[PDB]
């Protein structure tokens, strides 16, 4: 029962939520013990490993705090199907292939997802500048025309969250993506990563309406079905999912009667006007700082959401 006191002394003290500072100039060891977060990468020695505290079970502790470690999705793709000149923080989309055993998956940037919609019928200049041939992408989806035709394209593409690591292999590329959790880059100088969505595909929804300001403003990706081929739009909102399907129906109110007026839904499966999915949360204050993405030839505008917490969801249909 005296070893119980030693075990509870090892178990009790949480990190300090409050600390009475006197001056900021002194920088006491107590406030340093408050503000310090244990790292995730260190050199390969016993001293550096024991100092960073990687070997602690569950969470890092030198020899729980509201932080969750991220999980990484490991994807193998063909080197032709992806452009190695992509930015780091760009959200991708794994397409569920129809073979029983594949080994190689199929992911799509929204730049690459644009040229599946374009052919058969600015942003498109950069998209056709990056990927030269759509036919090397339009066979990854084997039957794209049927799948768009019976409106079952939303349930075959699931989002995967932004990219973090892209090794530059020659035939079969392996990329790493954060499917859930705090998006942070795995680089030895730990640098931040900004989720980049191209500007013409990212229309804001707070300023589209034009007082209670919340913290977590979610980012919604939205597949819709158009007569000009499907479209992949991105919506930032500071509201709930219950709010987001109502306001997205109101936002798509001209487009539904457009698709109805040009084409009568002669069968029963053409009623679905696509679906939406929450890609995760970020801070509503310093969200979506505009920036640019330069290729060798041109440059398109692209939004840069910073400090994204990726959290995918299932597809909620729009009608």
């Amino acid at each position: 029962r005296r070893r119980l006191q030693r075990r509870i002394a090892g178990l009790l003290p949480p990190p300090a939520r409050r600390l009475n500072i006197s001056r900021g100039s002194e920088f006491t060891r107590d406030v340093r013990g408050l503000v310090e977060e244990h790292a995730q990468a260190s050199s390969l020695s016993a001293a550096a490993v024991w100092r960073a505290g990687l070997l602690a079970p569950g969470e890092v502790a030198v020899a729980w705090s509201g932080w969750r470690p991220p999980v990484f999705g490991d994807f193998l793709i063909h080197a032709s199907s992806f452009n190695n000149a992509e930015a780091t923080g760009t959200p991708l989309f794994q397409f569920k292939q129809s073979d029983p055993f594949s080994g190689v998956d199929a992911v799509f940037t929204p730049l690459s997802l644009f040229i599946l919609m374009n052919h058969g019928r600015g942003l498109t200049r950069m998209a056709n500048l990056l990927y030269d041939s759509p036919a090397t992408l339009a066979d990854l989806v084997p039957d794209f025309g049927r799948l768009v035709a019976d409106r079952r394209f939303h349930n075959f593409i699931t989002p995967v969250g932004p990219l973090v690591e892209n090794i530059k292999s020659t035939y079969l590329n392996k990329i790493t993506t954060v499917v859930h959790g705090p998006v942070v880059s795995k680089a030895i100088p730990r640098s931040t990563v900004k989720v980049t969505v191209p500007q013409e595909a990212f229309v804001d929804l707070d300023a589209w309406l034009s007082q209670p300001c919340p913290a977590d403003a979610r980012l919604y990706v939205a597949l819709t079905y158009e007569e000009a081929g499907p479209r992949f739009t991105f919506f930032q909102s500071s509201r709930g999912h219950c709010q987001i399907m109502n306001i997205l129906r109101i936002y798509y109110s001209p487009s539904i009667m457009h698709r109805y007026a040009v084409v009568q839904p002669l069968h029963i499966e053409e009623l679905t006007f696509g679906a939406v999915a929450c890609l995760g949360t970020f801070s509503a204050t310093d969200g979506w700082r505009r920036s640019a993405f330069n290729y060798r030839g041109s440059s398109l505008p692209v939004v840069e959401i910073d400090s994204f917490y990726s959290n995918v969801s299932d597809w909620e249909v729009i009608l």
């Binding site: 939520r17 500072i21 503000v35 705090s65 942070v184």
Partner: protein, 50 residues
Amino acid sequence: KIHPGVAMTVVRTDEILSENILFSSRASTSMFIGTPNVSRREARVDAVTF
């Protein structure tokens, strides 16, 4: 431009940006200064906000 059968008294308000002077006597108010305690609000995924 003829006169109607009635008149009006136009009231309006005019805002004036002044430069005030505040006087206050010695020892008018006793105050207790607390302690500047520091906290952690949010562990956002790249920046923590104290």
